[PDB]
Amino acid sequence: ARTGAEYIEALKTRPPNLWYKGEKVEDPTTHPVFRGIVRTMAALYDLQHDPRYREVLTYEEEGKRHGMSFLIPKTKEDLKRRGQAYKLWADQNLGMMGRSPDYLNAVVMAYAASADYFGEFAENVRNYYRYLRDQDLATTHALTNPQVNRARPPSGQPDPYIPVGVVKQTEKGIVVRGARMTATFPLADEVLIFPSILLQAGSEKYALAFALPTSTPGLHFVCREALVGGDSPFDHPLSSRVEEMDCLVIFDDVLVPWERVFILGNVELCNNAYGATGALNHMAHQVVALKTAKTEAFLGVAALMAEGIGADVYGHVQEKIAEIIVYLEAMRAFWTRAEEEAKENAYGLLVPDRGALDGARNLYPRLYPRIREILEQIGASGLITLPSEKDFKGPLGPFLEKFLQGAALEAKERVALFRLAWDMTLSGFGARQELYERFFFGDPVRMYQTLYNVYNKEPYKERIHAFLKESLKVFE
Amino acid sequence: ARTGAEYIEALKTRPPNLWYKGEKVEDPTTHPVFRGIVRTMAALYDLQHDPRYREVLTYEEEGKRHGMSFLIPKTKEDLKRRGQAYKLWADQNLGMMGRSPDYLNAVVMAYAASADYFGEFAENVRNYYRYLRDQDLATTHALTNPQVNRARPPSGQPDPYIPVGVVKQTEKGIVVRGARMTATFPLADEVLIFPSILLQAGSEKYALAFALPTSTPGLHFVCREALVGGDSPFDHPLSSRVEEMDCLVIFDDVLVPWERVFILGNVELCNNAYGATGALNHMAHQVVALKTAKTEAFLGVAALMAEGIGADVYGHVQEKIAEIIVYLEAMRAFWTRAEEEAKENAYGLLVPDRGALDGARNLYPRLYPRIREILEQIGASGLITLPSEKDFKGPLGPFLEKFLQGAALEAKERVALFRLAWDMTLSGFGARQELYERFFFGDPVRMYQTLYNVYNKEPYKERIHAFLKESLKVFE
Amino acid sequence: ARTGAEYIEALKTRPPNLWYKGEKVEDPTTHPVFRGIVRTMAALYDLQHDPRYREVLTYEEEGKRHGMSFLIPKTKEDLKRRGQAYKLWADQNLGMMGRSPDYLNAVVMAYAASADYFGEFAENVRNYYRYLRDQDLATTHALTNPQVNRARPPSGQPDPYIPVGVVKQTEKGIVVRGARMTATFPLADEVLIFPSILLQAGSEKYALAFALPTSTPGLHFVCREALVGGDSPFDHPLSSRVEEMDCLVIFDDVLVPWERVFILGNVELCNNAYGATGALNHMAHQVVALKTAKTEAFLGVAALMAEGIGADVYGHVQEKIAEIIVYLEAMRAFWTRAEEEAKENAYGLLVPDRGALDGARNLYPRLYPRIREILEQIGASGLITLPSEKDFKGPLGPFLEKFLQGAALEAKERVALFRLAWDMTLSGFGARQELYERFFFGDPVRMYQTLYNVYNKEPYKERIHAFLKESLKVFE
Amino acid sequence: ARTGAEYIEALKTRPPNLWYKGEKVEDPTTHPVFRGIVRTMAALYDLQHDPRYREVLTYEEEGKRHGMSFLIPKTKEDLKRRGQAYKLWADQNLGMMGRSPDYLNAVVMAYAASADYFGEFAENVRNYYRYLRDQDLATTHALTNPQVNRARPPSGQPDPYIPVGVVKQTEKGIVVRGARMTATFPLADEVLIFPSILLQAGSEKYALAFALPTSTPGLHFVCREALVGGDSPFDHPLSSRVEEMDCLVIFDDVLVPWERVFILGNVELCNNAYGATGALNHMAHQVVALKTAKTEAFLGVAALMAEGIGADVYGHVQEKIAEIIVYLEAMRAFWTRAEEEAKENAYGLLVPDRGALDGARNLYPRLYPRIREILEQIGASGLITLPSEKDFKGPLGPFLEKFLQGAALEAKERVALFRLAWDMTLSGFGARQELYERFFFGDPVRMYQTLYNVYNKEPYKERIHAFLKESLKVFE
Ligand SMILES: Cc1cc2nc3c(=O)[nH]c(=O)nc-3n(C[C@H](O)[C@H](O)[C@H](O)COP(=O)(O)OP(=O)(O)OC[C@@H]3O[C@@H](n4cnc5c(N)ncnc54)[C@H](O)[C@@H]3O)c2cc1C
Ligand SMILES: Cc1cc2nc3c(=O)[nH]c(=O)nc-3n(C[C@H](O)[C@H](O)[C@H](O)COP(=O)(O)OP(=O)(O)OC[C@@H]3O[C@@H](n4cnc5c(N)ncnc54)[C@H](O)[C@@H]3O)c2cc1C
Structure with a gap:
């Protein structure tokens, strides 16, 4: 398991071939545009060594300790462990980091467990998995x-x-x-x-x-x-x-x-790679835990904004917050069923239930825009009344502490909260998150068409045919 | 456990004081308006004696056999058993019967298990439960x-x-x-x-x-x-x-x-009766199983209509059916988590998780109108092109068998299917089902306000406060 | 202009070849299933002779008086006259009659005015128009x-x-x-x-x-x-x-x-018949007036239900009614612009603006299901608590007058109102109206694709290209 | 009528007391944060002197020429003139400038025309109007x-x-x-x-x-x-x-x-100021013209994006664009009816119809989020694949011209277009526009409650009462 320092040194030593505004990025660890996210990823790696979380984020195997996202689960208990690691990492950034490495480790882990799928390239897959795992890249x-x-x-x-x-x-x-x-x-x-x-x-x-x-x-x-x-x-x-x-x-x-x-x-091998290996199931497992964390963040902010400006006394505001609660529970439910209904695939790899995960990844893209809208409807003008910490530290600070206080909430705390709500929804960063949720797993139009074609609809059609027997009997 | 014959004889002997269009109903078992539903309830009771389902619908206790909805669950396995009985009964009528007695038996069962809640009237509750159970009323x-x-x-x-x-x-x-x-x-x-x-x-x-x-x-x-x-x-x-x-x-x-x-x-005892006893949890458990059955029925009909008229080749039609699949999985997920996260209440009664059930009963009223709309959008004019079996048996029958056939579907089967889809959505019976789903558990406006007030929002607010510490630190 | 008696005698003498449940309908004017609508159409014809409306519903020409829907409009004032006749007729039945003959008279009128479109069959069209008009069929x-x-x-x-x-x-x-x-x-x-x-x-x-x-x-x-x-x-x-x-x-x-x-x-002549002749414009003109009448009916019922049960004191109920008001105004706006922007087509026939009418006929199918939903959300259980006039006239009448009264509203008036609201939304008749609004003018999927293809999108694309010139100039 | 130079000199000479990040802004005409919008407003003023638009943007009166937004309209023709000026100015910035001064000039103009409303302060109002007008502030x-x-x-x-x-x-x-x-x-x-x-x-x-x-x-x-x-x-x-x-x-x-x-x-005078003076009507008139311009911009961009990447061949994409067309026509309709149904208020000031304007300002806040969503659904990943002009001018330029070209669209033009679509929806600037549209005219919850209370609902309730007479007659 890597430390943040090791990750930072690796990027500094052998940086990715990144380009920003016509120029090569020589050191992403210090570049103004990338140093922040680099520091954040480093913190995720460092958490693996925190005594409080070592047992949650890593596992021991033959003298080595690896990140949990590399664990080939053999039992539902193992699936739960992977889920808890996904969740703990997601919570660190309020579910705002959508492409943390554990998502792809789930893919590679599944590819390796189901390596036979790749035929002559099976050993390459197994070896690559061990490489990523051992170096925790x-x-x-x-x-x-x-x-x-x-x-x-x-x-x-x-x-x-x-x-x-x-x-x-x-x-x-x-x-x-x-x-x-x-x-x-x-x-x-x-x-x-x-x-x-x-x-x-x-x-x-x-x-x-x-x-x-x-x-x-x-x-x-x-x-x-x-x-x-x-x-x-x-x-x-x-x-x-x-x-x-x-x-x-x-x-x-x-x-x-x-x-x-x-x-x-091999066109066919490419088209069925995620489904056959179980990579789809495991990567979607990381996603449901991640979106549960994200929804928890929005619930907390929505509740604090409403309480902060005294809007919580209004029925419709309470209803909007309750809507987020319903969506939160829906995601928790998909997550629970995905693990509880898990079964082994053709290669013997235990995979979380696709029915539940297809439900989660096709429903959340519809729920997120609404969750975002709810924050907008609750905060209203408070979401753009964003003075800077510099304004509070400036000559008008005293005035701001009076006019921007909330109900039993000091002005600095109020603005810090609304600055967060704004960053989660209306800043360029926040708005991008909306587009990301709508499309990261694929185009909803095609994802829904895919679900229609892969889902076993026969049991339901058969029950209707059975029910209609009485209808057709009138002609006997 | 009652037989259908016993139920029919009981209503005939001591009929409820029903009135229809200014007149007393002397025998609901033969009255044109009620004989149908009476026959249906009778069939549910008869199913309890079918060898194939006796173990699912009833349990033995001290020489007697009682309906499963009366079982005071002691383990999650017992909860699962109650759920399977709810589901089997629901499936018999495509989830269209919303007030079958097992819903209320769940309430009385919980009241009895948590009888201490009622104080001096506790024995009355326990005795009433045994009465309903023993006579299977x-x-x-x-x-x-x-x-x-x-x-x-x-x-x-x-x-x-x-x-x-x-x-x-x-x-x-x-x-x-x-x-x-x-x-x-x-x-x-x-x-x-x-x-x-x-x-x-x-x-x-x-x-x-x-x-x-x-x-x-x-x-x-x-x-x-x-x-x-x-x-x-x-x-x-x-x-x-x-x-x-x-x-x-x-x-x-x-x-x-x-x-x-x-x-x-006692105003307070009334207001907390369902929550404190666990009746809310158990009655909502019957509901989630019921709505899962209902959604399965709509999925089957939607798929058959689309396939029947060749509309399934169109992407948007496939997407609409996939939407029903997503909702079906959402309800299955709530059901699974409700049972898996079950815990004992203050009276020692094991109750399914309220978080999951509150999610299910507050989400489905929003999903149902859409599921109904989907059937309308798929069937279009086929939903009102409803000749009668009498038309097929009449002089124009041969013409109807030609003009109303579907894609690899005979005309009689096609019309039987669309007559069903129509009865599930546009007949007076079908339309009422929509209003029923929107309101049977309560007014959504107040149900959402209730959820807001009972839900523990503190953990999420605390996580945001922790996240904002770094924001306020800039003033140190 | 026909009288109701003349219409009734015509159907009785030469009835349409109707079949109901395997049997030929010998006299639709007395048949239980058809006598009601026949009486209603007859009333529309009789209104043409009412002194108060004769000038609105008919026009004089060379000694004869014809129904307004046959008037070939030469001025915007004439268009307004046709619109007022559409509206007056629509109001008689709360906009619930969707296929009153004036809709098709608009089509035939346009076909006749643009008769040259039909080539060798032009005289047939002109003659057919005169036939329908003269006999007011x-x-x-x-x-x-x-x-x-x-x-x-x-x-x-x-x-x-x-x-x-x-x-x-x-x-x-x-x-x-x-x-x-x-x-x-x-x-x-x-x-x-x-x-x-x-x-x-x-x-x-x-x-x-x-x-x-x-x-x-x-x-x-x-x-x-x-x-x-x-x-x-x-x-x-x-x-x-x-x-x-x-x-x-x-x-x-x-x-x-x-x-x-x-x-x-002639495939091409068929495909462009409605657009080229202006029939589309005129039939859509009748439709916008009709839907305006329909929305006015729903607004009145919604307001009366809310006031009747004291639900009007609640903010969200007021908002729902205001939503209907917004939709009502939207339809009135489309209607006004359709007439004000009218221009002559290739055959010299003045036709209401297609932009406004395409907006109205493609928007209302989306608005109607919501208007219907609003009535459901306002009325709640009152929509199925429908005793009959027979119950009020029966032994329990006195009890009903106490339990079903509203806020400053007597029970009989209350139930009459809710029976109407129910018939407009949840009865088989009411539910059908929803399907009708969604599809009568065509399948929304194809109507929207048609609008995309016929609409002149060039002006807007050109304005964007002009705006982007400054963007591309950075490379000069 | 002011020139851009005069406006720039005025702000430079007597700048508003603005503060940005704890510091006073000494010259907004050169400050990095404000110079852009200042240049834009200046351009609006300069347009008043362009020969092509002088007659549209200004009017002559007693030797002076004033901006059209100051014109006290006496005829519907005058209302149309004000509307055309609102529209021409709005088009210059694709309807993205929501607070251009003509909106407030409409308010002051109405206040002045209805000056008697203000009693003893009437002359102050009239004088203030003349001041703003004469100096074109x-x-x-x-x-x-x-x-x-x-x-x-x-x-x-x-x-x-x-x-x-x-x-x-x-x-x-x-x-x-x-x-x-x-x-x-x-x-x-x-x-x-x-x-x-x-x-x-x-x-x-x-x-x-x-x-x-x-x-x-x-x-x-x-x-x-x-x-x-x-x-x-x-x-x-x-x-x-x-x-x-x-x-x-x-x-x-x-x-x-x-x-x-x-x-x-005076609490009452404040509460009825906008309605009584007609300021509400005129300011809403500027708004409907503005939103029509804004919708035209979104239509153009949506059409160009779809055509640019070949997504226009897909039915659902065509439908989304058609949806924007429907909304565009709805706004045009409200605008037309607002002018056509104009009548004089209590002070003799001609005001555009409130029914139509209340419809427009209460409907658009609901339509805008959807229009924005449509652009997101059409552009997908193209909306975040935004290299800079610097990347095109850099070493990788040749590669970008190959990989980012569209269907018959060069890469630079493609990216310029998507950069615009992104700025209209997902940049911090674009996202703010969404919040702005939702709330600038007020909180929808209260705006809808206000509409419910001010609207004359009596005619519709009366028509229903008349219709129900036949229902109550069964008891006679
Ligand atoms: C913020 C963000 C982050 C992302 N991160 C990653 C990442 O880390 N790794 C990665 O691999 N991908 C990533 N993606 C890509 C993402 O998976 C795609 O956006 C998604 O799969 C949709 O593909 P597209 O963008 O090419 O859509 P396009 O198809 O290019 O968009 C236009 C389309 O037109 C319609 N359309 C196009 N083709 C068809 C068709 N055949 N049938 C029906 N309709 C059609 C679609 O409905 C859509 O409107 C990310 C996307 C976003 C927005
Ligand atoms: C088909 C059907 C079957 C049913 N079956 C049963 C059954 O078997 N057993 C049973 O006990 N019940 C049953 N019900 C009743 C059902 O529980 C109620 O309809 C539901 O609880 C809502 O109450 P209501 O109908 O009185 O709504 P009302 O409140 O009477 O309806 C008008 C309301 O105005 C608003 N409103 C009213 N008061 C308030 C308020 N205080 N705050 C905010 N808004 C308010 C509401 O939003 C709603 O629009 C059934 C209902 C239906 C439609």
Whole structure:
């Protein structure tokens, strides 16, 4: 298990090939745009060594101690342990960090347990898993193709190499060219180029699955406009520390060593990789715990805002808070059933129930925009009446302590709270979180179509056919 | 455990004091408006003796066999058993029967287990429970006051005796006068006059809880417009058999024997009766199983309609069906967590988790109108293109078999299916189900306000206060 | 202009070929299922002769007086006159009659004014218009194909003649075979078999437009389950008089005289018929006036229910009523702009603005379900606490007058009001109205796709391109 | 009519008492946070002198030329002229500037026309109007009290002088102390301290209406966190120029000259000021034109995004764009009816219809969040894949031109478009716009309650009572 210091030194020594506003980022650990999130990830690693949480965040195996997200669960009790680790980490950042490495460790863990799925590349998968686990490395991933012409398949874009495709194969590995649309949290040692959108037949050239060090020659991470509001924790409680960053990933004829290839030219293997291995189940397990943590944060802020300005006496405000409570319980329920109904898949890997997890990941994207709206409706103008800590420390401070106090709440505490509520909803950082919740697991339109097609609807149709027998009997 | 024949004979011998369109109903077992639901309840009782289900629907105790809804659960396994019985009964009628007796047996069972709550009337409660259980009697209940002037409390209506109040107390019992707004499924042996809406202080005269035989002199059940469409199972698949009926309950100076009094003149005892005894938890447990069954029925019909007319090839139709699947899984999740997180209350009675059940009963009333809308959007004009079995048996039958066939679906089967979908949504029977789901457990406005006030919001507020410490530290 | 007596005698003398539950309807003017709506239509015709409304409902021309819906408008003032007639008729039935003949007269009027559109069949159209106008006949229409396999076009159904197609052409006319899915209000003298869903190319055999007397040999109207609750105006205020009925229309090798053919074998002419002639504009004009009347009815009932039970003192109830007011004003606005922005089409016919009307007909289907929901949320249990006038006239009458009174509202008036609210929302009649509003003008999915494709989006895209010039200038 | 240069010189010479992060802003025309919006307002003033728009934006009167927003309309034609000026100005900034001065000029214009309303202060009002008009000054306003304890009235806060109240009256004027919660666009010469939230009786001390130069001693504007993303028009197309800023307004014993007092100690006069004068009608007229412009901007961007990435071929995307079209038409309809149904008020001032305007201002706050959501659903990940113009100008430029091109759309144009869509929805600037639309005209909860209480619901209730006469007749 890594310490924060080890993670920081690794990024400083071998930084990912990041670019920000036309310039290469030489040291993300000190760069104004990245130092905050780096410090945050470091804190997650340090927590693994805190006496109070060591048993929750790590497990011992043959003299070594590994992060819980690497544990291949054999019992429901093991699943619960993984869930508690997901939750503890999520709580540290109010569920605002959506791409912490444990999400991808769940994927790799499942891939390894179900390694036979990958055939000749099975050992590569098992070895890669052990590598990430032993070194406790941080990962990032990019699964979607560039949004160019969505009316056409990967092979029908303006260029054959817009999506990541194989240029050639050599004795050392494969050379790839193209790009992936989005990679969140590029402050990692490794990047996973795994499957994502159901590949249409005839996409062999793009049917790939591999992993590479983020410093690989030819690999570039082009970062989008930064959303770090500033470094003041008072003024920017969340964006100053949890801005994970999103980036376009470019592959300029990058060489991928054979040992890092997991899938090559197999459309079907790519399309069923997450489902067959159980990676989908485990990554969705991290997600449900994460969204439960996120909803708990919104509930706390909503309750404090309402109490703070005396709006809690109004029935409709109480109802809005109760709505968040209902959603919180819904997510807790999905989480509980996902673990309780867990069963082993074809490779003997225990996986949390897909019915419950598909429910959770397809419902939350609909609930989040409403939870966000609720905070807006409760806070109203208080959400934009945001003087800075500098204003409180300035000449008008005394006036602000009088006009911005709440009901039995001092002004500084009030503004600190509303600055947080604002950062969770209306700052560039907060607003991005909404788009993220709507799309990170996929496009709802296609996710729902996928659920329709994979779900076993037969039992229900059969019960209706049985019920209708009495109807058709009138013709006998 | 009662047989259907015993239930039918009991109603025939001592029928409830029902009134329909100005006339007394002498025999509900043969009356056109009630014979259907009576036959349906009888079938539920008969199922308890079917070899295939006897172990699911009943339990043995000291030489006797009782209905599962009377079982005082001591373990989570016992809770699961109660849940399976709720579900099996619910499935028989596609979750369309909302007031089957097991819902109220759950209430009485909890009242009995937590009998100490009722003080001097504790033995009355325990004895009443044993009575209902031993005779396996059917019950109905009326908890709300007449909707007259909602701007005023029970003691501020046009008359002091509009709501049910105590006129006087004698050596034999109490005399009550007034009325209860609604009682669903009056085809029962007993009626429960228990608490409902939080009684405002100073309502001692109305703070009552008692039970009476439905044939009690002075007791009247005034039934509303019947929604039985007809007796043909083809033409009216549901209304011909599951029309439970709703009625206003009048008390014309009715005498309530002391042995049937459970609460008298105690406002606080009335207000906390369901929560303290665990009746709320257990009755909500029956509800979540019931709504899961109901959602399964809608899923089956939606899938069959879409497949039947070839609408399933359209993405948005698949998405609508997937939405029902998400809601189905949400209800299953609440059900699972309610049982898994169960704990004993103050009286030692194991009760399903209130967090999960409050989530389920406050979310479903919002989901149901949408599930209903989905069926409407899928079926479109097919939902009103409803010829009768008589049309198929008539001269134009051959034409109908050609014009109303579906995709690989014969016309008679198609119409039988759409007649069912229509009866579940647009017939008077179907539309009532929507209003029922929106309000049976209470007014959402007040249910949400109640949830806000009872829920422990402190842990979440505390986590936010802890997170904000760093914000306030900038002033040190 | 026809009188009610003339309409009644016409239906009695030459009744439409209606079928109800396997039997031919010999006299719809006395049949229990149809006499109510017949009486209602008759009343609309009689209103044309009422001194108070003669100037609003009719116009004089060359010694004759015709119904306003036949007026070919030459000025905006004329458009306003047509609108006032639509509104006055709509108000008589609280906007619950959706297929009153003036809707189709608007279509025929536009077809006639733009008769050149039909080429060689132009005179047939002009003559047919004069016929309907002079005799002031009632019409019904059926535009959609049988819902069999929606995954395939009209020519790809289980049989080539499921949709109405031409079997052969003779010296006397064309012989057609097939069926139309739905025709509402079949209590008419004539049936219009006009285009509806955009016909896919290669559907020449189905590209038809003609009209026939409803008594034509081989023509059959198969009625669906009746929704007439009863004849008591107290018990069934709306269904006893406004149940228009829906039916499947069968064509058993029906002969269509050449003089009644308006379009034959021309796919493109069918697809653009409503838009090019202005029929779409005028029929949508009747619709916006109708929905304004309907919303006014719901506003009145909602306000009376809330006031009646004292629920109007609650803020959220006031907000719900205000929501209906907002929707009412939205419809009034669309109506006003539709008339004020009217311009002449390619044939010189003044047509109300399509932008405003497309807005109204695509927005109301979304607003209506909410308006209906609002009534449900306001009335709650009062909507199913529906004793009959027979109960008030019976032994328990005195009790009902006490328990069902409202706030300063007598019991009989209260129940009459709630019986109406119920009939507008939850009776079979009321629930059907919801499905009707969602689909009568077409499937929202396709209506919205149609709006996207016909709307001129260029001005807005051009303004954005102009705004972005400054953005691209940074590269100069 | 002012020129941009004159406005800039005025702010430079006598700047408003603005504060940003603890420091006084000495020159808002050059300050990084304010120079953008100042330049934008200046451009609006300069447009008044453009030959192409002079006739639209100004009118001549007795040798002078004034801004159209000052025109006291005498005819509907005059109302139309005011509307066209509102629209032309709104279009310049895509409807993103919500507090341009013409909104408040409408208020002052109405106050002046209805000056008799103010009694002894009538001449002050008339004179103030002429002052603003003649000098064509810019105004800002603050109408709400500090959000401290919303459970109590203005006189029940932690201090009597939290809200703005009169300390004393002297021969020179009144001295006020307290604060107003929010003032948007403080880059003005004058600030209007007018009424807002219905004052509870007994608030005489707070019942005020006056205006002051923004440089008045003791007056302070405390600005919130700035949302200007940067100065690059490519990177921040909107926030670089339309960030109006919001601020808390402090009154440290400010002296208000008697000539600038319009209402003093009159609760009722304050509560009915906007309605009685017609200010509400005219300010809402500017708003409907503004929101129409805003919706046109969103329609253009949505259409361009969809076309740009080839998403327009998908039905659901077309439907989403059509939804925006429906909302656009709804706003156009409200605007048209507001002008067409205009009538003179009690003071002879022609005012646009309140029914239509109340519909528009209570509906748009519900429509805007959906319009914003639609852009999010169309753009998806493209909304956060935002490289900078600096990235295009850097080493990776060539790669970006390949991977970020769209369907027949070059990469630079594509990113410029998505940067705009992002700035309109997800940047701090964009997200604030959502909160602004939800609340600028007031709290929807109270706005809807206000509409319920002011609307004449009698005609509709009367029509229902008339319809129910037939129901009650069954008892005769
Ligand atoms: C904040 C954020 C963070 C993210 N983080 C990551 C990450 O860390 N790693 C990663 O791999 N991905 C990440 N993503 C990408 C995310 O998974 C995608 O946005 C999502 O899968 C949708 O794909 P898209 O963005 O290409 O949508 P697009 O399809 O490009 O968007 C336009 C679409 O048009 C419609 N459409 C397009 N094609 C079809 C079709 N075939 N059928 C029907 N409708 C269609 C869709 O409804 C949608 O409106 C992130 C996204 C966001 C917004
Ligand atoms: C089909 C159906 C079946 C039912 N079956 C049963 C049954 O079997 N047994 C039984 O006991 N009950 C039954 N009920 C009654 C049901 O529990 C009630 O409808 C529900 O509790 C709401 O009470 P109400 O109907 O009196 O609502 P009301 O309050 O009478 O309705 C008007 C209300 O105005 C508002 N309002 C009123 N008072 C307040 C307030 N104090 N604060 C805020 N808002 C307020 C509410 O939002 C609602 O709009 C049934 C109801 C229905 C519709």
